[PDB]
Design a binder for these strands. Structure first.
Length: 58
RNA sequence: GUUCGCGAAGUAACCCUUCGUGGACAUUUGGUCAAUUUGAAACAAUACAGAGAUGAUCAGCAGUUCCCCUGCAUAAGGAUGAACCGUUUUACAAAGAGAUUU
């Protein structure tokens, strides 16, 4: 009962707040540095532009 | 200051000197810049780790960059020079069926 589906199923099974305004400013700094880093290296993933703009809508 | 012209004194002196006068020669530099912190160099000092493929040990060459450094450099080197991996929802429909409000 050592069939390959059991091994691959178990290797799938093995693989698994804001308070103040300046804290939200640091949150926006961290998140905009993240998304401008992943838009500076790749300017052609349009989903990334979409979700960073939708972040700044949020 | 030098020279040219004139006058006045020494001085009833064409020698010389002094004083006064008009002219000419000569005509607008340097600073983007102030002498220790407070208009910005970076390394080094501490401490810890100690390299990209994966089971280990590695040669690399590349690409993107709103990262540069050493290099005379368009060569070459810098860990393959470094960051790359991270999140991840709508150009969004059409057909068919039943359960609901009127």
């Amino acid at each position: 009962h050592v069939s390959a589906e059991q091994i691959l199923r178990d290797v799938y099974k093995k693989g698994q707040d804001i308070l103040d305004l300046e804290e939200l400013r640091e949150y926006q700094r961290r998140k905009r540095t993240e998304y401008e880093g992943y838009l500076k290296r790749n300017r052609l993933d349009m989903g990334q532009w979409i979700r960073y703009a939708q972040f700044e809508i949020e």
